[PDB]
Design a protein around this ligand. Structure first.
Ligand code: MN
Ligand code: MN
Lengths: 348, 349
């Protein structure tokens, strides 16, 4: 009952879909073995790459496939197109810059090859190495102009550092030059923040992912990234990492902080936080196949700014697709949500 | 829109997360800041509120300190009939000298009891405790229920980086169930172990860090099985549930995924889903969130009987917020629950 081809009145374009390369997963394993992995890596990838559980082993196998098996899984859930990115944390944790750039290059060329082979099914977002912002800028050039990619995905922090630092500016300069979106995907929190979450089993997707990612998007908003770069669009998954829900409180407390001069890095902005959510931020529902949360986001940010995502293979659930197809929404809204918003914002 | 006391609009306005301070305890914070024993959160939060020359800070400190006619006037001016009062975060929880903590918490509780006696139709008390000493805290829970007329207690999230899911804190929960009173988990700044990236961006306080710390704490309690151990226990949180109601689908999906894959020895099977515990054991206020779409979303998730009005005076003392809440496109029956009768039930007023 879930079919490709758009007969139900829209294509299903899934906008937060993951893959891995074996050589990068082997680096994570090396890091865990040699003690250079951070606590988040040990937690996340010591689980996914090593647990014998059904969940981990299926995720690992699915991540590594970029062909007929992934296509079969998409066919079986009626997914027309998938926007693919290297799974978190990509090469961001790597201490050897030459190794990070090499592996990122390879992962990008691997993705490009797959998209060339399945051009009606797979759409690519590039991976970068923000450890090297200037290289990353050139890799943004290459993905947009040579590889056919539609943007980049950054897996939140790089070695405990956030994108609001001036150090990272070449990434933003390059994105606005090629006029492509940035997708800030979660990662585990850095060692400076993870301990109370990790000790309770909360460091991953259940909680810590949202803390890390929402903090990252928020600190970019509050540093004025969209005043510096008014064309820039930043996408986040998981229903906006709670930011839409907190909006009233964000704006109230932002304004209080600005006016009171409480903080060096919180100065006046040209728009409210609400205003940036309406003009510069875009949200997917990855992991949140939940009609009230989706409708809430659509109401707060505008229906044109909210997109369907599956989060394959971390959350591959046919009944979720069925629930999304069944939502109490107009045909027109549902087509935006499943298809045409993604067509617009990713320039498909 | 006139804001009047007396319920002529169809309900009393019962404000359920309202703060006060004591000069002696603020002086301790200043001492800890000066001597270097204050954590980064204390330096940030109380360095600001107790020392900032900012207009917001100065007026907030004066209002915090008043437990009399000024506070009453401020309530009258915004049509607030009753305020549920608690010692402002982080209370005595950061203190290293337990004699001092116990003495100052006793004093603060005595002061609050005295004020509530003076204005018994306007002020309702929640006790403060010192979780560093869970035995003393248990006695203080009983003292507040027996002698002081209090309706429960407020704990200001973590105590020196230690969380209530730890077995050490069990005597506090045992005492709450014995007196049959709720726990309000109010925010605090994050501990030094988690605060640094937030603090650097100006995000450690009410804008963001408070919700992270508090949502985390409540999620840790849910997932340790506090409500299987204590099925009668009610835990209240402000700020529209510290995002948990909005995350709920993701919370349950990933909690179940973790348990079934045996990922964390800490995370064991629970008798209810997280959704089940929200509907049976957690209560939410809208402190700081005078925003209809979020209130209505939370009502749908939790049930309209489980969501209450709060002002968060004096940190967020805004007449126009009251006006907006009075004017929500919501039935008279639901509005009366939200402002009045839910609080009357859950606080046993
Ligand atoms: Mn994902
Ligand atoms: Mn408060």
């Amino acid at each position: 009952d879930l079919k490709t081809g758009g007969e139900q009145g829209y294509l299903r374009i899934a906008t937060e879909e993951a893959f891995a390369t074996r050589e990068i997963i082997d680096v994570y394993l090396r890091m865990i073995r040699d003690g250079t992995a951070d606590k988040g890596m040990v937690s996340l990838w010591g689980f996914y790459a090593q647990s014998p559980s059904e969940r981990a082993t299926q995720i690992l196998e699915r991540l590594l496939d970029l062909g007929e098996r992934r296509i079969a899984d998409m066919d079986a859930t009626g997914i027309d197109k998938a926007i693919l990115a290297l799974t978190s944390p990509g090469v961001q944790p790597l201490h050897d810059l030459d190794e990070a750039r090499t592996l990122a290059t390879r992962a990008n060329d691997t993705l490009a090859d797959a998209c060339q082979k399945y051009p009606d099914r797979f759409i690519g977002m590039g991976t970068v190495a923000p450890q090297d912002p200037e290289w990353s800028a050139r890799e943004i050039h290459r993905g947009a102009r040579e590889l056919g990619f539609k943007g980049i995905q950054i897996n939140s922090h790089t070695q405990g550092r956030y994108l609001d630092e001036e150090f990272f500016d070449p990434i933003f300069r390059a994105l606005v030059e090629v006029d492509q979106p940035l997708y800030i995907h979660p990662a585990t929190s850095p060692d400076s923040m993870i301990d109370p979450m990790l000790e309770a089993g909360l460091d991953g997707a259940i909680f810590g992912f949202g803390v890390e990612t929402g903090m990252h998007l928020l600190r970019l908003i509050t540093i004025g990234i969209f005043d510096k770069y008014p064309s820039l669009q930043i996408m986040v998954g998981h229903m906006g990492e709670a930011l839409p829900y907190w909006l009233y409180r964000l704006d109230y407390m932002h304004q209080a902080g600005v006016r009171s001069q409480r903080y060096e890095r919180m100065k006046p902005l040209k728009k409210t936080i609400e205003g940036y959510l309406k003009s510069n931020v875009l949200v997917t529902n990855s992991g949140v196949a939940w009609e009230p949360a989706i409708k809430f986001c659509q109401q707060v940010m505008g229906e044109d700014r909210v997109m369907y995502a599956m989060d394959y293979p971390y959350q591959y659930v046919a009944d979720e697709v069925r629930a999304m197809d069944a939502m109490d929404m107009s045909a027109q809204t549902k087509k935006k949500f499943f298809q045409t918003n993604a067509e617009k914002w990713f320039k498909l």
